[PDB]
């Protein structure tokens, strides 16, 4: 069990941790989140009561350090910071607990939802997408752009997702134009799985990272990336059986977790009708098909 204390809560804000979240009132004595499961990545995020634009947060992993939260009034937002002094940190943590000014990571033990969403998400991979290597945690918001979007401005704030382009030399072997483009197996298996990602589990990690970034920040580039990663698999006639079965589980939990009223911007009508009904893998996402039909019959 890990803790993430907050110095202070100067401003009214909705705080989120993983898929949980709490309203905190201006200068309410809030001082942190306790009983956080060591073992996966987590993400703590924020929406100010005054600017429902710009949701923002930080991905992190307690095994990499002791992190806390402090409001910065020059920049006007909650910043994640790391305490290097081992002793000084346990001291703030134990006092606020004994003053009980902390909320408990509220995990039902039947619920496997966060793990199912983050199974393959590794911090090391996250920090190669949000490059800022003086910090062990990664900052994301609503308005950050990806590298593919910058191509079609400020590169420090880039989301360096892996670039997938169906109509590119990379994706299309000369002479196999029609083949490679109707049947993306080449691109998936050899270019992306064996070449760039090395294994299935990285691929999935990025796909899952993409999803969460879109869900928690309505990061529009992240949505696009996630659907592109889905699309590449679903447009591939030859996929390892383990990936198909894992993919059906990975999406299922993604569809399950999504707020019901956001189904319009976060779900690309084309990609999903292709995955479930048109593409090679129509028959292979039994669980994702079913949740999709009973939850969002409209979009289909």
């Amino acid at each position: 069990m890990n803790t993430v204390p907050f110095t202070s809560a100067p401003i009214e804000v909705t705080i989120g941790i993983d898929q949980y979240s709490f309203n905190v009132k201006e200068n309410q004595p809030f001082h942190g989140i306790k009983d956080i499961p060591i073992g996966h990545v987590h993400v703590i995020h924020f929406q100010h009561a005054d600017n429902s634009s710009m949701r923002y947060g930080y991905w992190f992993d307690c095994r990499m350090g002791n992190f806390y939260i402090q409001y910065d009034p020059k920049d006007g937002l909650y910043k994640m910071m790391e305490e290097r002094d081992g002793a000084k940190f346990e001291n703030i943590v134990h006092n606020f607990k004994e003053r009980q000014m902390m909320v408990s990571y509220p995990k039902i033990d039947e619920d496997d939802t966060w793990y199912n969403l983050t199974e393959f998400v590794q911090m090391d991979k996250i920090r190669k997408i949000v490059r800022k290597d003086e910090n062990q945690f990664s900052y994301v918001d609503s308005s950050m752009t990806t590298v593919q979007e910058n191509e079609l401005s400020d590169p420090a704030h880039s989301l360096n997702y892996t670039v997938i382009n169906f109509k590119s030399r990379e994706a299309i072997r000369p002479g196999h134009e029609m083949e490679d483009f109707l049947d993306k197996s080449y691109y998936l298996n050899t270019v992306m799985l064996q070449g760039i990602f090395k294994n299935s589990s990285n691929y999935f990690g990025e796909l899952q990272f993409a999803f969460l970034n879109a869900m928690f920040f309505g990061n529009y580039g992240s949505s696009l990336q996630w659907h592109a990663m889905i699309e590449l698999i679903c447009s591939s006639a030859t996929v390892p059986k383990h990936m198909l079965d894992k993919l059906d589980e990975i999406l299922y939990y993604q569809i399950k977790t999504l707020p019901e009223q956001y189904s319009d911007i976060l779900l690309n009508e084309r990609v999903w009708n292709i995955c479930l009904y048109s593409s090679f893998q129509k028959n292979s996402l039994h669980n994702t098909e079913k949740i999709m039909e009973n939850k969002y019959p409209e979009l289909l």
Binding site: K167, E177, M178
Partner: peptide, 10 residues
């Protein structure tokens, strides 16, 4: 469109 676009990548 797609066929030609693919074919004209060069």
């Amino acid at each position: 469109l797609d066929p030609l676009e693919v074919h004209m990548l060069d």
